[PDB]
Amino acid sequence: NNVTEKELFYILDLFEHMKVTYWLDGGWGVDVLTGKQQREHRDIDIDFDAQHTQKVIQKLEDIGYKIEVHWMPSRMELKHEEYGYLDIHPINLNDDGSITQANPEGGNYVFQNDWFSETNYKDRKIPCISKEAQLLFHSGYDLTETDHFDIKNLKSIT
Amino acid sequence: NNVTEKELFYILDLFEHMKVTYWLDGGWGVDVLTGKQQREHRDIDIDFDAQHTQKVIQKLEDIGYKIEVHWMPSRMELKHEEYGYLDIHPINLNDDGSITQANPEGGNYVFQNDWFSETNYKDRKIPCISKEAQLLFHSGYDLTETDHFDIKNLKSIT
Ligand SMILES: CCC[C@@H]1C[C@@H](C(=O)N[C@@H]([C@H]2O[C@H](SC)[C@H](O)[C@@H](O)[C@H]2O)[C@@H](C)O)N(C)C1
Ligand SMILES: CCC[C@@H]1C[C@@H](C(=O)N[C@@H]([C@H]2O[C@H](SC)[C@H](O)[C@@H](O)[C@H]2O)[C@@H](C)O)N(C)C1
Ligand SMILES: [Cl-]
Ligand SMILES: [Mg+2]
Ligand SMILES: [Mg+2]
Ligand SMILES: [Mg+2]
Ligand SMILES: [Mg+2]
């Protein structure tokens, strides 16, 4: 049921084939920063260009993902019988160079651009959020045992 | 108004003369990691060995700090007419090797040992929380402009 490296690569291929700018986030994002798989994963988190929201959802449905949680335009969780869980997060990629997310209520989060980057993982280049961003969006007073493991793995990155 | 480097050192000295294990935290903790002062600070945050809570409070009171809000177990917020604001956070250095802080809603927060570090600041060794711990206890979705400034100062750390 867990999301294997091969299944992650397939999802990465989907977005790249669709020419949708995106970055891997969450737990697989942590492992990718370390250069190898560290643990089993329930899910993949992908942050993606919000202008392609409709065709991203449609393609995921087309290959068998079922929508289970729809918190859009903030977040959506889908589930595939083989590929596992996938959470997508639409983000706004503005012509003025800025990268934003709508504030669930009022306003816009303005991300730091260098929080979105790329790493060479087993000689594939994978766009992903940075180690710094991973630590920033983790919450120190709200950590699971698995969060603790991931944070230690980030620390081991030279 | 603020808390100067000289004032900071004197508060650090109090803990050292009391022989209480402690770590500098908060904004001054960020500056110390970088090795020089970066901005004016309204307060000091110090995490310290909870076994010494009673004598630590007594000494702060003896030199003239007044308790503003008593939030045990999390912390005590204090204020001094000349030295300004000081928050202290009692942490438990357990014989099982864990480091924890009580959570008023049940259980405890678990910290990692390597979040408690030190650095050479102007040829003084100051114990302080780590760079990664500072990022971790910041909240990505709730950063002020000063938080961003503080965080970028940690980038610059070669
Ligand atoms: C540099 C930008 C990083 C941002 C962080 C990411 C995000 O929102 N993650 C959520 C996650 O909450 C839970 S994990 C605890 C969810 O399980 C997970 O799917 C996911 O939503 C939370 C940690 O902030 N954002 C879109 C972009
Ligand atoms: C390493 C584990 C120890 C815990 C971590 C620490 C913590 O939360 N510090 C925050 C502080 O952010 C602001 S200061 C800039 C807050 O004002 C301050 O209260 C304070 O939370 C960190 C970002 O500097 N805790 C009390 C104990
Ligand atoms: Cl630990
Ligand atoms: Mg994930
Ligand atoms: Mg997730
Ligand atoms: Mg502070
Ligand atoms: Mg503070």
Q: What is the DSSP string of chain A?
A: ----HHHHHHHHHHHHHTT--EEEEHHHHHHHHHTS--S--SEEEEEEEGGGHHHHHHHHHHTT-EEEEEETTTEEEEEETTTEEEEEEEEEE-TTS-EEEE-SSSSEEE--GGGEEEEEETTEEEEEE-HHHHHHHS-TTS--HHHHHHHHHHHT--
The alpha carbon torsion through A145, B117, A141, B91 (nearest 10 deg) reads 100
The long-range contacts involving A11-15, CB below 8 angstroms and separated by at least 24 positions, are A11/A44, A11/A46, A11/A83, A11/A86, A12/A124, A12/A126, A14/A59, A14/A60, A14/A63, A15/A46, A15/A48, A15/A56
Mutation target vs A (from B101, B135, B139; most A CBs, 10 A cutoff): B135
Closest-approaching ligand to the CA atom of A89: 1
Residue type, B142: D
Task: Write down the experimental method used for this entry.
Answer: X-ray
Cβ contact A136–B140 (<8 Å): yes
> Is residue B137 within 8 angstroms of chain A, CB to CB?
yes
Pocket-forming residues, ligand 1, beta carbon under 6 Å: A 25-26, 45, 47, 75, 87, 89, 111, 115, 129, 133, 137
Residue B120 backbone dihedrals phi, psi, to 5 degrees: -85, 110
Residue type, B99: I
Cβ contact A140–B136 (<8 Å): yes
Tokens for B153?
């100062």
* Helix-strand-coil split of chain B, %, nearest 5: 40, 35, 30
Pick the closest to residue A17 from A56, A75, A67, A62 (CA basis).
A56
Cβ contact A135–B139 (<8 Å): no
Sign of CA dihedral A102, A104, A107, A113: negative
Helix/strand/coil for B156: coil
HEC secondary structure over B52-105: HHHHHHHHHHHCCCEEEEEECCCEEEEEECCCEEEEEEEEEECCCCCEEEECCC
Residues of chain B contacting residue A139, judged by C-beta atoms under 8 Å apart = 136, 139
Residue B119 backbone dihedrals phi, psi, to 5 degrees: -155, 155
For chain B, counts of helices (H) and of strands (E)? 5, 9
Whole-angstrom distance, CA of residue B110 vs CA of residue A137: 18
Beta bridge partners of B77: B69, B87
Q: Which of B22, B25, B41 to mutate to test the pocket of ligand 2 (most atoms within 8 A of CB)?
A: B25
Which residue is closest in CA terms to ligand 2's atom 13?
B26
Q: Is B115 in the pocket of ligand 2 (CB under 6 A)?
A: yes
Go through the domains of chain B in sequence order and give each one's CATH number: 1-158 (3.30.460.40)
**Taking a C-beta distance cutoff of 8 angstroms, is the pair A52, A20 a contact?**
yes
Residues of chain A contacting residue B105, judged by C-beta atoms under 8 Å apart = none
Q: Chain A closest CA to B92's CA: distance in Å? A: 15
Cβ contact B140–A152 (<8 Å): no
Whole-angstrom distance, CA of residue A106 vs CA of residue B89: 34
Helix/strand/coil for B151: helix
Q: How far is CA A90 from the centre of its chain?
A: 10
Residues of chain A contacting residue B149, judged by C-beta atoms under 8 Å apart = none
Rounded (5°) CA angle B51-B55-B61? 140
> Is residue B102 within 8 angstroms of chain A, CB to CB?
no
The set of residues, in sequence order, having a beta carbon less than 8 Å from that of A113 and lying 6+ positions away, is A97, A98, A99
Tokens for A116?
């979105």
Q: Which of B112, B133, B138 sits opposite A148 (nearest CB)?
A: B112
Tokens for A157?
């990155």
> Is residue A67 within 8 angstroms of chain B, CB to CB?
no
Between the CA of A143 and the centroid of ligand 5 the distance, in Å, is: 13
